[PDB]
Design a protein around this motif. Sequence first.
Motif, PDB file in Angstrom:
ATOM      1  N   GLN C  22       0.842  -1.187   0.000  1.00  0.00           N
ATOM      2  CA  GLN C  22       0.000   0.000   0.000  1.00  0.00           C
ATOM      3  C   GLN C  22       0.874   1.233   0.000  1.00  0.00           C
ATOM      4  N   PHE C  23       1.918   1.218   0.826  1.00  0.00           N
ATOM      5  CA  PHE C  23       2.812   2.351   0.929  1.00  0.00           C
ATOM      6  C   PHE C  23       3.770   2.432  -0.240  1.00  0.00           C
ATOM      7  N   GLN C  25       2.888   2.592  -3.131  1.00  0.00           N
ATOM      8  CA  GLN C  25       2.264   3.457  -4.129  1.00  0.00           C
ATOM      9  C   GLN C  25       2.341   4.948  -3.837  1.00  0.00           C
ATOM     10  N   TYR C  26       3.073   5.344  -2.803  1.00  0.00           N
ATOM     11  CA  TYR C  26       3.204   6.761  -2.456  1.00  0.00           C
ATOM     12  C   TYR C  26       4.533   7.320  -2.918  1.00  0.00           C
ATOM     13  N   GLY C  27       5.446   6.420  -3.252  1.00  0.00           N
ATOM     14  CA  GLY C  27       6.749   6.832  -3.704  1.00  0.00           C
ATOM     15  C   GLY C  27       7.580   5.613  -3.988  1.00  0.00           C
ATOM     16  N   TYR C  45      11.852   6.413   1.680  1.00  0.00           N
ATOM     17  CA  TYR C  45      11.499   6.834   0.309  1.00  0.00           C
ATOM     18  C   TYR C  45      12.644   7.624  -0.286  1.00  0.00           C
ATOM     19  N   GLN C  50       7.541  12.287  -0.728  1.00  0.00           N
ATOM     20  CA  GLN C  50       6.856  11.014  -0.747  1.00  0.00           C
ATOM     21  C   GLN C  50       6.541  10.656   0.696  1.00  0.00           C
ATOM     22  N   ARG C  52       6.112  12.613   3.083  1.00  0.00           N
ATOM     23  CA  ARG C  52       5.044  13.475   3.531  1.00  0.00           C
ATOM     24  C   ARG C  52       3.683  12.938   3.105  1.00  0.00           C
ATOM     25  N   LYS C  53       3.655  12.229   1.985  1.00  0.00           N
ATOM     26  CA  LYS C  53       2.427  11.644   1.465  1.00  0.00           C
ATOM     27  C   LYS C  53       2.081  10.414   2.286  1.00  0.00           C
ATOM     28  N   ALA C  54       3.103   9.636   2.635  1.00  0.00           N
ATOM     29  CA  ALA C  54       2.882   8.461   3.449  1.00  0.00           C
ATOM     30  C   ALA C  54       2.398   9.004   4.793  1.00  0.00           C
ATOM     31  N   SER C  56       0.642  11.564   5.492  1.00  0.00           N
ATOM     32  CA  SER C  56      -0.735  12.029   5.525  1.00  0.00           C
ATOM     33  C   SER C  56      -1.713  10.874   5.740  1.00  0.00           C
ATOM     34  N   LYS C  57      -1.202   9.643   5.727  1.00  0.00           N
ATOM     35  CA  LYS C  57      -2.056   8.479   5.923  1.00  0.00           C
ATOM     36  C   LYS C  57      -2.219   8.064   7.389  1.00  0.00           C
TER      37      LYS C  57
END
Lengths: 81, 79, 80, 79
Positions: C22-23, C25-27, C45, C50, C52-54, C56-57
């Motif tokens: 799942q992770f 796909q964020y980077g 990452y 990236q 930072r995107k992980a 946000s989850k």
Amino acid sequence: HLDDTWVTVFGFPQASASYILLQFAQYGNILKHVMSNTGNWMHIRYQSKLQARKALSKDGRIFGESIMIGVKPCIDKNVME
Amino acid sequence: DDTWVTVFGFPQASASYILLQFAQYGNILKHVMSNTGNWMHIRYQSKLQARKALSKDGRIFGESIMIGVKPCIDKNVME
Amino acid sequence: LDDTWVTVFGFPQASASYILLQFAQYGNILKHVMSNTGNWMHIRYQSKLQARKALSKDGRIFGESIMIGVKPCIDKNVME
Amino acid sequence: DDTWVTVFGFPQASASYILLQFAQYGNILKHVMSNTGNWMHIRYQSKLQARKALSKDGRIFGESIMIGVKPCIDKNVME
């Protein structure tokens, strides 16, 4: 077309190296072989192109247990010298 | 169905590293890792993605682990 | 490169492989270290963006009702 | 409501041990476990106590359980 008698067997743990080598001795006369220190593969040189093909036919089969083995035409020129 | 693929030849310790490698060839809708060991089944979303994985058959990954990739044939796994 | 590291937690061993995917796909996951004992893994990452995107989850649900936690990685041994 | 927190990241079998653990931050007036998810919602007495719970986000509890704590956002539960 001498390179056509070399195959590269791979996918086994170092502890099973000799076992797999024995298995492939069933497909013909191994005139030479080169194991690898780093990777999970060995290079086997058969006596005839016909024996190499028999080895190749074994790509994807499960050996001696829980070991799916891959067999591809050898392409390492340094090894085939 | 031509979307399933089997990846093999890696020691259990490199299993998730290899799955990470194969994730970059398409969107993995499902994966099954053999317990007996040595292989895993991956089902991409599109056939073009499976054929992308399929083409890495024989390639050497990272720590020098040659990997095998073949069409999946374990029917019971593919459901 | 501490700001490219993140630690994901809160899932049972059974779901570890699924969470890593799942992770993924964020980077681009350049490195990952999973704990054999704890319910968390360390993921590195390529870029801070990236991570930072992980990040946000944190606190959201992944499929099977698995609420995941995500915090900046502070384990200096793992990052080294 | 600023007294509700939702704790998460633990297996069904550690639910009571975690609740017991979060009982040392204030008086837990009401608590709701989820039959499906790895989380519970805890209603504390003061917001002061609930902030103390939240300060525990990301910490490893007892054994090998990293715990997540966030403000409760489930309106139904906060009925």
